[PDB]
Design a binder for these strands. Sequence first.
RNA 1: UCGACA
DNA 2: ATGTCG
Length: 133
Amino acid sequence: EEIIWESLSVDVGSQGNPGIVEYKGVDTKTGEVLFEREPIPIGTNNMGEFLAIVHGLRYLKERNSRKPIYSDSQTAIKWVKDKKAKSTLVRNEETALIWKLVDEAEEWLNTHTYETPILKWQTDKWGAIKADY
RNA sequence: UCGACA
DNA sequence: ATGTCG
Ligand SMILES: [Mg+2]
Ligand SMILES: [Mg+2]
């Protein structure tokens, strides 16, 4: 019910789905952009949302921050929780990059620890997530 | 299919 | 329209 302003918010920006995917993380309070991923030619919205959360986890861990992460992606939150991105995107030559990033994200997750709460941003009550494009 | 999150 | 979960 309460927005934890002392947090990191992430979100994906896409052009087509499957289509070009990029993502960024911002300070929920100030909107300051803390990180951005170079656009990936082909990927799905959910894969980008997943990557955004995992990158967020790595970003906070490297800085010893215990701040939670907000994502408005039901799918990505579950994937991170299970440490498994159950994407249906075909694995082929043009989806090689997004899949490599997804695979490496899962890999990091299974080899590192964190207590970072991953919270659902309630868009229907609070409006667009702060990392929205 | 329905409901939901994008 | 397309990607995913409950
Ligand atoms: Mg989103
Ligand atoms: Mg949005």
